[PDB]
Structure 1
Amino acid sequence: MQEHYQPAAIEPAAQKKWDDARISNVSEDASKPKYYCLSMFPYPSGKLHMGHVRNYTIGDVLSRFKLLNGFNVMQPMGWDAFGMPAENAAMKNNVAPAAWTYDNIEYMKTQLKSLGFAVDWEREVATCKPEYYRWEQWLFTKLFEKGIVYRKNGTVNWDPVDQTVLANEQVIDGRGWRSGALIEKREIPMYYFKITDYAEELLNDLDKLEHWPEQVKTMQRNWIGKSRGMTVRFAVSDDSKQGLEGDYAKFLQVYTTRPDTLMGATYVAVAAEHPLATAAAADKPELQAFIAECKAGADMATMEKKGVPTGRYVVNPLNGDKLEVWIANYVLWGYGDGAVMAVPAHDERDFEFAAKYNLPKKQVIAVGDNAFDANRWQEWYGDKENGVLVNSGDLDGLDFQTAFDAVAAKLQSQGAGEPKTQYRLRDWGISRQRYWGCPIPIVHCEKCGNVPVPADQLPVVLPENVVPDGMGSPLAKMPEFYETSCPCCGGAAKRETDTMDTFIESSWYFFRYMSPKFSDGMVSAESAKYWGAVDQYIGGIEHAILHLLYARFFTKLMRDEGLVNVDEPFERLLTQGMVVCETYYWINPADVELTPVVISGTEKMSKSKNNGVDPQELINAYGADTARLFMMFAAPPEQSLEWSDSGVEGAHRFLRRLWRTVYEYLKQGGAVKAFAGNQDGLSKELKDLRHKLHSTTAKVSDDYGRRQQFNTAIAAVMELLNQYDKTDTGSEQGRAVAQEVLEAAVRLLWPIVPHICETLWSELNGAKLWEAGWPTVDEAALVKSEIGKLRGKITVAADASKADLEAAALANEGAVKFMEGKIIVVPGRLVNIV
């Protein structure tokens, strides 16, 4: 054994050893219990930085923990390769996005392989390859035929200068980002997944996810946004029918989730495009301009709420009050009825609207004896659970649910309204007017219409010999791509030139890893049956809503097609915290050392301030194990992690110390058979070290397996080494216990720092580390030894309580013979019955 720790020497040798034994290349091995650990696969956008490395280290720690415990572990890796990053670089560097993407993949694969992650590279996928994306084209065509995917006009942000469609993120103050030209809203045909048909399933199945963080489930429930409420109709007054046709001449219909407060409605509000808004605005120039301002305008709660009165009235069907209709900019045409009622005394938005315009407020709910103040909003005004109806005539005294049913009763009997369930969830628009994405497998025929490509003609292949220029999608300018023949009639036709939302690839990639070479389907039945669901998913909170909901949606779509048999894709979910670092100017922290540049503020590792720390720089300086160790030790995985030059150094020193501990141990006599069995006759000090050892094994196992807090696992091993360092292990029985401690220490740490622990393990023991397996707890090592006047002595467990001593004291042969018909308890010394 070499004396000094040389990571640049041992790490490639250890990685070579693991690849040769194919430890991480796995099959559907029925002889071993499966474990599917998955980290969110990256966009191949450049270099990974320490932030990404934290994510993949965590996955590797859990994977290797399960490996050592005998599982058949699949830890797959892959490339989320479509999307905007490459198209910017395609414009930026005058390079094909494909060429730039594949180049990126190679740099990052070697980056990852150098960190020593236990990854099945034979299951690697790149989502920009036709062998991948053909299967999401296939699913598209199957769902299109069933109407689960449909085509429909939607409105988009058109920039007339750049001549491209803009995302709302790129629409600042009404104008485009790279142009500052006023955005034109355009109606164009687009494709949608009917995700609203699955809203109830997506919502209720969250309850199954007992090993998901509660806030993730809460964000999903709120995004879906189910409500059980009331459709309510307000008769238009005789004086207000002016201009209205059809059912709009008869009644104004709203949706409300507080029908229990209908007796406190003091005005109503309609969207700019509502027919009432149009009829009122006919001879009223002020309303015309307000309608116009609304049409041009996420930012809902942020925007100043505005309205104008219309002079039109509707009648409350419960109390007969004539209420004025307002046009308001917060009422959106396309959600529910495009009109709402307003209850300023019990809804905070209505309260502010009403306090702005001096509109009436009517208290119709009281909460205990809390007093009502029409000039100050108070949280209890909105109380749905502890309030009870006041000023509501007949309804006076009911609670929310009974008044709901009473109002539903009354309304239905008048024909004036019915209960209704609504969802905030919109359908999922997947059309993108971008080149670097999966082609939509539709052909447009002037005779047959929009027709799906037949399955045997899939994939529709995206040409990779393209350099976009940002002045439109190149596919719409590429005759050799879009000219084709109709699959239904043989006539001349045109391919769809929009590509798919690149969330589509990340919505099923975890199934493709089960059989990434399968050519007869998205995923083979044999492999989906074996791998089941992802046991453990690790990724950033930024994907807690859309990506996770889409992946759950796709799972249920695929189950309903018969391709998988689970309802939910991810059993456990771990949300690793951000990684932050000081900034400098914008100079990368590897171009800087400190005691001329400006040492600015600490913030998330990103390209914005060029403060991403390149893991390759960190490997070249200290080795992979030091990088892994620093990030697993610096903070619990969920907490944010501050980059620290001294933290990295102190991780490295720990690895030197661990190296030197095994070396000095082996210099003083070479390896011995590790202590095992009965420890009676061991000295107190070696008993205490064995106690620390097996306590440490139980804690690390709990920290890896239950708590997933790796930083405290490492601290516990350092404690063991500390007690080892103060224990005389020179004797024969001492060396056997030292061997036991070191064989367990290097195994306990192997998931965190596998290169050094693989190397040290082999100097200690000739067996293969993964066959020796995860260290076991020796419970016998966890048992400590047993411990008026005076008349009796008793033997007590070392963990005996003060009532166990008083128990055995009161029942002693010398006590009872001196009792003749207070009990001061000194633990470990004496007990006296006075």
Structure 2
Amino acid sequence: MQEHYQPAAIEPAAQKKWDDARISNVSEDASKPKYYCLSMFPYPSGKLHMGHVRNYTIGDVLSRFKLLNGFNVMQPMGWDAFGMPAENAAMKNNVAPAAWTYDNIEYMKTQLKSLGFAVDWEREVATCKPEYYRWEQWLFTKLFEKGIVYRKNGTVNWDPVDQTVLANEQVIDGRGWRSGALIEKREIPMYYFKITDYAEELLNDLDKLEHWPEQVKTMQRNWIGKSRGMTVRFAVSDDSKQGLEGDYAKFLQVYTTRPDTLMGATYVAVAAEHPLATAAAADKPELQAFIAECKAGSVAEADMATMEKKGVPTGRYVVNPLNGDKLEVWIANYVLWGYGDGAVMAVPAHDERDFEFAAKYNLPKKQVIAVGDNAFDANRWQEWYGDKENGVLVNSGDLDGLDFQTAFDAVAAKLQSQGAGEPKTQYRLRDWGISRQRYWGCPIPIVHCEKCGNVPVPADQLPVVLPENVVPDGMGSPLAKMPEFYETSCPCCGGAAKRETDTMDTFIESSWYFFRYMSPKFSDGMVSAESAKYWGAVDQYIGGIEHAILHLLYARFFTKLMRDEGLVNVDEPFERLLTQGMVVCETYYRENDKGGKDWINPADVELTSAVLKADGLPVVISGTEKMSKSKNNGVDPQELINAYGADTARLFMMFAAPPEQSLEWSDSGVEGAHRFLRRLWRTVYEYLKQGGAVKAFAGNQDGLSKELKDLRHKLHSTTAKVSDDYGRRQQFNTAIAAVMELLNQYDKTDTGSEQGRAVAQEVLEAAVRLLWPIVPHICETLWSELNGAKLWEAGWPTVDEAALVKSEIEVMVQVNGKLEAAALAN
């Protein structure tokens, strides 16, 4: 055994040892209990980042821990390969997106393997291969004929200079983020998943996820946004019917979740596209300008509640069906056409948004709820204004004194008797638009025929292969300019036809890849019935918080779709969910000629102040934030691996912070991780240099010295703490510190005697197995010097209960014939 720890010597050897043994190449074996640990598969962007290493080390810690506990562990990895990055790099470098993608996949795969992740590489998938995306095309056609996928006109943001569609997030003050040109609102046909048909299922099944963080479930419930409210129809006043036709000339219909406050409505608001807005704006230019600005907006959903709420009066009036109050109709920008009736009522006294809106325009506020003897101030919002649990109605005629639920039913009774309303359930959830005007994506398996219509491609003809011999030029979507691709014959009548040229939302590939891992070479379905029955669902899912809403919802949606098709047997894809924190780093900048700042990468800086590691001039040390190319502060994990080895990288990330907490890059912290790995190496080397390995202590410890009994107690309490940290709390930093405390007590214990050597062997054999999930290379190597058995067959260390019992000293007491501090307690 070499005296000094050298990762480059031992890390490749241990990896070949694991690969030769095929410990991570698992099958559907009915003898061993299964464990499916999955980390969110990455985009092949080019090279691993520090967040990748943290995500996939966490998965490897939990996977190796369950492996040592005798589980049949599947930890698969693949490549979420489609998307815009390969298209931009194609436009920048004059390379095909597929070639750029497959080169990145190969390099990053090398990086993942060099980190020693226990991964079943025989189950690797790449979502840009026809062998993969043919099966989401298949599900597309199957759901298309059922109507779960449907085609409909929708509005997109067209950039006329970049000749491409932009999402709301890419529109800055009505202009494209890169082109700077005014974007145009265009109505084009697109395809949608009818996800609202599954809204109640997706909402209620969240209750089954006892091992999900409550914030993720709460974020999903809010996104679905189920409400049990009331449709209410306000009759249009006789003086306000000019320009209206149909039911819009008769009444204004609204949806409210607070029909108990209907007696407090002081005005109503309609969307810009509402017929009342159109009729009132017919001769009022300010209204036309207000309507035009609302239509031209591109507020993203994450920013919808933070935009300033503005409105204009219409001069039109409607009648409250309960009290007869005549309320003026306003056009408001927060009322969205397509949500409900595109019209709301406003109760400023008990809805905070209505309170600020009314305070802005000096609109009336009528208190109709009371909570105890609290004072109501019309000029200052108080939180109890919106209380639904502990309020009684006031100023509401015969509704006074009622609570929320009894007033709800009474108002429903009054409105239904008049025919002016009825209870109604609504959802904020919109249908899922999957059409993308992009090239590097899964082709939509639809053929357009002027005789047969939009026709799904038959199953025999799938996949619709995306041609990889393409270099996008930025003058529109390439597929739309490739007659060799879209010109085809109709599969129904054989006539002249054209393929769909839009590609799928790349969220689709990541909505079912966890099932494909179960049988990634199955050629007769999305996933084989045998593999799905065995692996069931994912036991542990690890990923970033940025996917807590859309990705998880889409994955749960696809799981229920595939279940209804009879392909899988589970209602939920992910049992346990672990969301790991971001990785932050210091930033460095230099002031600019033009009054700006030039951000410098940390690796090109040396501390002392701070100066460049190649030049000699000083730079400015700035704030710490998430590693990104924005402020040029991304630390390359490859340089960390090259400088210290994979175990140091894995150890630092697990020790620096709990997995959910933000991890700050620390040069001294990395050195501390490497120094501990050297200490662990020296501890084993020095132990073996003083007499070699012996049989580890086991059995009755009566007769052991007090010092060695205390070391066994610390040992088996460390094992219990570490097991509870890996399995239950999932806090790996405290598990490392516990092993460090065990090594500290070992260092202070004399283990020179025959029984001392036996206890020392027991300590080190457990310590290397307790740390094997975190730093497997050095633990695999150190274990082989201590014991001949295979580490993974020796299994996770067991807790000796007898090592935790303390020896009593039952003594008798007598005063005047019928430890001295214990008798003082007596």
Q: Same fold (TM over 0.5)?
A: yes
Q: Taking structure 1 as the reference length, what is the TM-score of the superposition?
A: 0.94
- Cα distance in 2 between the residues matched to 1:755 and 1:292: 64
- Kindly indicate whether the alpha-carbon contact (under 8 Å) linking 2:694 and 2:758 is maintained by their aligned counterparts in 1: yes
- Cα distance in 1 between the residues matched to 2:40 and 2:708: 45
- Kindly indicate whether the alpha-carbon contact (under 8 Å) linking 1:233 and 1:254 is maintained by their aligned counterparts in 2: yes
Q: Identify which range, 531-540 or 467-476, moves more after superposition.
A: 467-476
- Kindly indicate whether the alpha-carbon contact (under 8 Å) linking 2:813 and 2:823 is maintained by their aligned counterparts in 1: no
Deviations 1:655-697 (A, max 9, x none): 1111011111001111100000100011111111011100111
Per-residue deviation, 1:181? 1.4
- Classify 1:39/1:249 alpha carbon distance in 2 versus 1 (closer, same or farther; 3 Å): same
Per-residue deviation, 1:600? 2.4
- Kindly indicate whether the alpha-carbon contact (under 8 Å) linking 2:44 and 2:104 is maintained by their aligned counterparts in 1: yes
- Classify 1:3/1:264 alpha carbon distance in 2 versus 1 (closer, same or farther; 3 Å): same
- Cα distance in 1 between the residues matched to 2:811 and 2:624: 57
Q: Secondary structure at the match of 1:436?
A: coil
- Classify 1:796/1:369 alpha carbon distance in 2 versus 1 (closer, same or farther; 3 Å): farther
Per-residue deviation, 1:620? 1.2
Q: Secondary structure at the match of 2:716?
A: helix
- Classify 1:299/1:725 alpha carbon distance in 2 versus 1 (closer, same or farther; 3 Å): closer
- Classify 1:761/1:518 alpha carbon distance in 2 versus 1 (closer, same or farther; 3 Å): same
- Classify 1:153/1:811 alpha carbon distance in 2 versus 1 (closer, same or farther; 3 Å): closer
- Cα distance in 1 between the residues matched to 2:361 and 2:478: 52
Give the paired residue count: 802
Q: Secondary structure at the match of 2:283?
A: coil
Per-residue deviation, 1:349? 1.1
Per-residue deviation, 1:795? 1.2
Per-residue deviation, 1:799? 23
- Classify 1:361/1:105 alpha carbon distance in 2 versus 1 (closer, same or farther; 3 Å): same
**Coordinate RMSD, CA, aligned:** 2.3
1:249 aligns with 249
- Cα distance in 2 between the residues matched to 1:122 and 1:688: 47
Deviations 1:201-260 (A, max 9, x none): 000000000000000000000000000000000111112222211111111100000000
- Classify 1:484/1:690 alpha carbon distance in 2 versus 1 (closer, same or farther; 3 Å): same
2:98 aligns with 98
- Cα distance in 2 between the residues matched to 1:544 and 1:653: 37
- Cα distance in 1 between the residues matched to 2:337 and 2:279: 16
Per-residue deviation, 1:796? 7.3
Q: Secondary structure at the match of 1:104?
A: helix
How do 1:115-194 and structure 2 match up within 5 A? 115-194=115-194
> Which runs of structure 1 show a deviation greater than 3 angstroms over 4 or more consecutive aligned residues?
796-801, 805-812
- Classify 1:796/1:68 alpha carbon distance in 2 versus 1 (closer, same or farther; 3 Å): farther
Deviations 1:2-21 (A, max 9, x none): 11111110000000000000
Per-residue deviation, 1:289? 2.2
- Classify 1:676/1:247 alpha carbon distance in 2 versus 1 (closer, same or farther; 3 Å): same
- Cα distance in 2 between the residues matched to 1:811 and 1:134: 78
Per-residue deviation, 1:598? 2.9
- Kindly indicate whether the alpha-carbon contact (under 8 Å) linking 1:785 and 1:797 is maintained by their aligned counterparts in 2: no
Q: Taking structure 2 as the reference length, what is the TM-score of the superposition?
A: 0.95
Per-residue deviation, 1:329? 1.6
Per-residue deviation, 1:350? 1.0
- Cα distance in 2 between the residues matched to 1:416 and 1:797: 87
- Kindly indicate whether the alpha-carbon contact (under 8 Å) linking 1:784 and 1:798 is maintained by their aligned counterparts in 2: no
Per-residue deviation, 1:587? 3.0
Deviations 1:112-151 (A, max 9, x none): 0000000000000000000000000000000000000000
Out of 490, 500, 503, the residue aligned to residue 499 of structure 1 is 503
- Classify 1:806/1:251 alpha carbon distance in 2 versus 1 (closer, same or farther; 3 Å): farther
Per-residue deviation, 1:377? 1.0
Per-residue deviation, 1:607? 2.0
- Kindly indicate whether the alpha-carbon contact (under 8 Å) linking 1:153 and 1:189 is maintained by their aligned counterparts in 2: yes
Deviations 1:558-611 (A, max 9, x none): 000000000000000001111111122433322222113333221111222222
Deviations 1:175-198 (A, max 9, x none): 112222111100000000000000
Question: Does 2:825 align with 1:811?
Answer: yes
- Cα distance in 1 between the residues matched to 2:168 and 2:161: 16
- Classify 1:798/1:632 alpha carbon distance in 2 versus 1 (closer, same or farther; 3 Å): farther
- Cα distance in 2 between the residues matched to 1:649 and 1:767: 32
Per-residue deviation, 1:288? 2.2
- Cα distance in 2 between the residues matched to 1:334 and 1:132: 36
- Kindly indicate whether the alpha-carbon contact (under 8 Å) linking 2:77 and 2:124 is maintained by their aligned counterparts in 1: yes
2:799 aligns with 777
Stretches of structure 1 that go unaligned for 5 or more consecutive residues are 787-793, 813-834
Per-residue deviation, 1:807? 17
Q: Identify which range, 428-437 or 615-624, moves more after superposition.
A: 615-624
Q: Secondary structure at the match of 1:617?
A: helix
- Cα distance in 2 between the residues matched to 1:809 and 1:410: 79
- Cα distance in 2 between the residues matched to 1:566 and 1:389: 46
2:587 aligns with 583
- Classify 1:363/1:14 alpha carbon distance in 2 versus 1 (closer, same or farther; 3 Å): same
Q: Secondary structure at the match of 1:312?
A: strand
Q: Secondary structure at the match of 1:487?
A: coil
- Classify 1:663/1:305 alpha carbon distance in 2 versus 1 (closer, same or farther; 3 Å): same
- Kindly indicate whether the alpha-carbon contact (under 8 Å) linking 2:175 and 2:181 is maintained by their aligned counterparts in 1: yes
- Cα distance in 1 between the residues matched to 2:812 and 2:294: 79
Deviations 1:531-563 (A, max 9, x none): 000000000000000000000000000000000
Stretches of structure 2 that go unaligned for 5 or more consecutive residues are 590-598, 609-617
Q: Secondary structure at the match of 2:282?
A: coil
Per-residue deviation, 1:305? 1.6
Q: Secondary structure at the match of 1:420?
A: strand
- Cα distance in 1 between the residues matched to 2:696 and 2:815: 32
Q: Secondary structure at the match of 1:606?
A: coil
- Cα distance in 2 between the residues matched to 1:72 and 1:424: 42
Per-residue deviation, 1:750? 0.3
Out of 598, 607, 629, the residue aligned to residue 607 of structure 1 is 629
Q: Identify which range, 592-601 or 238-247, moves more after superposition.
A: 592-601
Which protein is bigger by CA-based radius of gyration? 1
Deviations 1:350-371 (A, max 9, x none): 1111111111110000110111
2:296 aligns with 296
- Cα distance in 2 between the residues matched to 1:567 and 1:498: 31
Question: Does 2:778 align with 1:756?
Answer: yes
- Kindly indicate whether the alpha-carbon contact (under 8 Å) linking 2:153 and 2:188 is maintained by their aligned counterparts in 1: yes
Per-residue deviation, 1:800? 22
- Cα distance in 2 between the residues matched to 1:430 and 1:295: 23
Per-residue deviation, 1:409? 1.0
- Cα distance in 2 between the residues matched to 1:346 and 1:55: 44
- Classify 1:580/1:319 alpha carbon distance in 2 versus 1 (closer, same or farther; 3 Å): same
- Cα distance in 1 between the residues matched to 2:762 and 2:243: 91
- Cα distance in 1 between the residues matched to 2:814 and 2:356: 63
Deviations 1:293-331 (A, max 9, x none): 222124432222222212211111110111111111221
Deviations 1:588-644 (A, max 9, x none): 322222113333221111222222211211111111101111111111111001000
